[PDB]
Amino acid sequence: GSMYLINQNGWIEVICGSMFSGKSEELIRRVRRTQFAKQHAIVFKPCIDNRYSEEDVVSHNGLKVKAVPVSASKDIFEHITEELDVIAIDEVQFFDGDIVEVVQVLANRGYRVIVAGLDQDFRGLPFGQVPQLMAIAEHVTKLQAVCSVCGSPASRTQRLIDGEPAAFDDPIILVGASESYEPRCRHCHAVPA
Amino acid sequence: GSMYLINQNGWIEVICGSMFSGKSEELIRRVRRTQFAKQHAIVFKPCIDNRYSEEDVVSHNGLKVKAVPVSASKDIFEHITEELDVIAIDEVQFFDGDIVEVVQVLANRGYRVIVAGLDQDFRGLPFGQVPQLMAIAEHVTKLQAVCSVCGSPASRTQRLIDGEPAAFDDPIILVGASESYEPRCRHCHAVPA
Amino acid sequence: GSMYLINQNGWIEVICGSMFSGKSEELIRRVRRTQFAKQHAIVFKPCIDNRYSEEDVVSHNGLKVKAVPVSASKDIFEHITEELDVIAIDEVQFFDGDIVEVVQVLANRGYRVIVAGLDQDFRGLPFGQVPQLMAIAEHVTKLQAVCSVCGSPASRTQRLIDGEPAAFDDPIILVGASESYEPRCRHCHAVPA
Amino acid sequence: GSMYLINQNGWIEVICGSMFSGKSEELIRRVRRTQFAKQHAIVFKPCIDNRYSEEDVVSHNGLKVKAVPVSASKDIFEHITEELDVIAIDEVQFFDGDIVEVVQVLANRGYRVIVAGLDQDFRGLPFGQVPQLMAIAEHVTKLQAVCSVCGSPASRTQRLIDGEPAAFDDPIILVGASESYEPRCRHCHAVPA
Ligand SMILES: Cc1cn([C@H]2C[C@H](O)[C@@H](COP(=O)(O)OP(=O)(O)OP(=O)(O)O)O2)c(=O)[nH]c1=O
Ligand SMILES: Cc1cn([C@H]2C[C@H](O)[C@@H](COP(=O)(O)OP(=O)(O)OP(=O)(O)O)O2)c(=O)[nH]c1=O
Ligand SMILES: Cc1cn([C@H]2C[C@H](O)[C@@H](COP(=O)(O)OP(=O)(O)OP(=O)(O)O)O2)c(=O)[nH]c1=O
Ligand SMILES: Cc1cn([C@H]2C[C@H](O)[C@@H](COP(=O)(O)OP(=O)(O)OP(=O)(O)O)O2)c(=O)[nH]c1=O
Ligand SMILES: [Zn+2]
Ligand SMILES: [Zn+2]
Ligand SMILES: [Zn+2]
Ligand SMILES: [Zn+2]
Numbered sequence A, B, C, D: 001g002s003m004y005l006i007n008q009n010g011w012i013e014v015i016c017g018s019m020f021s022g023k024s025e026e027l028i029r030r031v032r033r034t035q036f037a038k039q040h041a042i043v044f045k046p047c048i049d050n051r052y053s054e055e056d057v058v059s060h061n062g063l064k065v066k067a068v069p070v071s072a073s074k075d076i077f078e079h080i081t082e083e084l085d086v087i088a089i090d091e092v093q094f095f096d097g098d099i100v101e102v103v104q105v106l107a108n109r110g111y112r113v114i115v116a117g118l119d120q121d122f123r124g125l126p127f128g129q130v131p132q133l134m135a136i137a138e139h140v141t142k143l144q145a146v147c148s149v150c151g152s153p154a155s156r157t158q159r160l161i162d163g164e165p166a167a168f169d170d171p172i173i174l175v176g177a178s179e180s181y182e183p184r185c186r187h188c189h190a191v192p193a
Helices: A023-036 A073-079 A099-108 A130-136 B023-036 B073-079 B099-108 B130-136 C023-036 C073-079 C099-108 C130-136 D023-036 D073-079 D099-108 D130-136
Strands: A004-008 A011-017 A041-046 A056-058 A064-066 A068-070 A086-089 A112-118 A139-142 A156-161 A179-184 B004-008 B011-017 B041-046 B056-058 B064-066 B068-070 B086-089 B112-118 B139-142 B156-161 B179-184 C004-008 C011-017 C041-046 C056-058 C064-066 C068-070 C086-089 C112-118 C139-142 C156-161 C179-184 D004-008 D011-017 D041-046 D056-058 D064-066 D068-070 D086-089 D112-118 D139-142 D156-161 D179-184
Touching: A011 A023, A011 A099, A011 A130, A023 A041, A023 A056, A023 A064, A023 A086, A023 A112, A041 A073, A068 A073, A073 A099, A099 A112, A099 A130, A112 A130, A130 B130, A139 B139, B011 B023, B011 B099, B011 B130, B023 B041, B023 B056, B023 B064, B023 B086, B023 B112, B041 B073, B068 B073, B073 B099, B099 B112, B099 B130, B112 B130, C011 C023, C011 C099, C011 C130, C023 C041, C023 C056, C023 C064, C023 C086, C023 C112, C041 C073, C068 C073, C073 C099, C099 C112, C099 C130, C112 C130, C130 D130, C139 D139, D011 D023, D011 D099, D011 D130, D023 D041, D023 D056, D023 D064, D023 D086, D023 D112, D041 D073, D068 D073, D073 D099, D099 D112, D099 D130, D112 D130
Parallel strands: A011 A112, A011 A139, A041 A068, A041 A086, A086 A112, B011 B112, B011 B139, B041 B068, B041 B086, B086 B112, C011 C112, C011 C139, C041 C068, C041 C086, C086 C112, D011 D112, D011 D139, D041 D068, D041 D086, D086 D112
Antiparallel strands: A004 C004, A056 A064, A156 A179, B004 D004, B056 B064, B156 B179, C056 C064, C156 C179, D056 D064, D156 D179
């Protein structure tokens, strides 16, 4: 018919869902495939995100990838060469208001942009600009973890403090607190005041 | 092991993408499957949406389903029985600010809520509350049409007026205008001023 | 990064599952997308397959596409031009032993070959050479209908004769018989002797 | 509508594709999800399969799961309790002729059976009884690796001996040979005689 199938580079993939749904696991396999395709990739993460590492992007499955920690979205530009093909960003919900513009510029320029972040905070509220990234992206993969109460598929992150469901208005940083995060379905998700 | 697999009803599925990506085609097959499963379904659409029908939900593939046209989101409640299992809503981007609350209430109540709508307007801007519906939904299916210029997969709706790309600020209703809508990829999508 | 993404044409997509799982519905949407991509497509079907049409490929959803009815697999070659990009074949389980070779030759030559057929006969046995097509294909989409007894997803075709489950060894053509076919899950599927 | 969604347990999932497509990576994430769902799982592998481990199921991503090595398919039965919910089998293409019967019996009994194996040998031939498992399974996931020559998605395992493509009739065990296996697309896959 016609030997080759020419297409245009440059698009956005969103990976979203609750904590432990596998966003970074999935970000990491996508970026790995990229290295076997002999393409050049870079991975960004927000400074604030230090749960498992300051330097790296780490999945709770135990796998990691080297990353560039960044404090404003527009700082991504300074790390970008023409040589690179793929830009991956983990924990995008923690990025400033620029992130949509940054990502659209990059996709318009020919970069494959892979973006992973929480769809919702612990309260069930749509998170950062993840909603907007979802709307504008060519691909959206919404992952589900397992509800830690009932076993069926989850779609929420449950914040617990001292073992009780967190309040709606509990600050994101509680200094000496014993807090924990687990996935739940919408029926076990509990947000009281 | 264990004869049966009990799960909890009540969740949200979003179907989104550009015009002609197949949102209503997909909404209609989902609702059909429902009838073979001997479940009861109802389909809502906005009053404003009269492209192919006032009464019905119609796909450009030529298939249709009976629907209830509604002018405010909260009017859905008056049409709901306990007997019904599935609530489908086409063209959700045209619904008022209540729609998220309406949908979350319905899913919390045990209804399977299937929601179809544009992710973006003709300008590439995230559309209504579709972004928020995407964030909060258990499932998101983002469909792609074919770019009518270059043939590769699309993610945008191109508005043309008199054959030229529409302006950014062109009103949604142009009285005697000759306008048309076609899918495009991000590279052929053209929004000038 | 790198403006364009060159790939090689020529591969095989299999669509399989029970009767009424949507194989032809899915074959037809794939072929339609092809026409909007301004590519040329041809659709083959076996002579034996006349349930809804002698001439055409028809889905129980009511949609159809023009087809070329063929009695041996190797007859496909006589209908193929260089101009065409896509070859679709419905009801592949009814094709002779050549079909795998025919399909592999076509994919090696640069054609996109889309193949739809039953994975299993009414007895639950792997059907024709669909198993082999599945093994060798780049893409396999296994569709599920709804179990007409219990409502959960199906994976089997139930043959009924006079309302009772057919026997294992009941001929495919029973002359004046009142027979019917419905999808079932593995638990409701009934094959006695 | 109706509080709960009762379904029947017992079905078959096939994961197939070339070497390095991620079959064990995918088998391992499925089995992990199972542990968070507080279900009991067991993983089998063939004795012959000792590439990374005698005891365990290992993915080239570096992740592993404890397994029970087995020499005949019917030996699976001796390891099965009523307490367990999930049976996973890696490298199924290396299992004897019983495997289909073993798997169908297990799914009919209520077990969730997850089966991973090569769709094709290094020659492009459909592998073991993987074709039959594909036909009869409720779910088929056909994974793709990256072609190590050209970068586009692969569907074949290339066997190389001394750096040259292996012959069609080269034995599976070559005693002191320097052999290697890499994924390729159908165009770079090379099987001479
Ligand atoms: C299904 C499930 C998996 N897991 C484990 C096994 C998975 O391989 C692993 C996936 O974890 P992650 O990949 O780290 O989850 P996440 O990536 O969405 O969060 P982040 O972006 O900050 O890293 O988590 C859980 O801890 N709980 C669960 O319910
Ligand atoms: C791929 C493609 C399909 N089609 C046709 C064939 C598809 O079966 C059909 C799908 O159309 P619809 O299903 O009507 O598209 P849409 O549903 O997203 O919009 P709405 O909600 O308002 O109804 O469109 C196009 O017109 N252009 C295209 O590029
Ligand atoms: C889910 C379901 C759908 N349907 C209807 C609605 C679907 O849109 C339609 C799909 O039918 P088809 O597309 O014709 O099913 P099939 O294509 O697999 O068989 P063939 O290749 O010979 O044509 O069937 C049923 O009849 N029973 C069901 O259980
Ligand atoms: C895409 C790609 C990944 N990889 C790496 C990264 C993946 O995370 C990892 C997946 O490897 P595996 O999961 O081990 O591949 P496989 O599981 O299909 O084979 P087996 O059943 O015997 O274990 O392989 C390659 O080595 N080559 C490739 O082309
Ligand atoms: Zn729960
Ligand atoms: Zn285009
Ligand atoms: Zn059933
Ligand atoms: Zn190749």
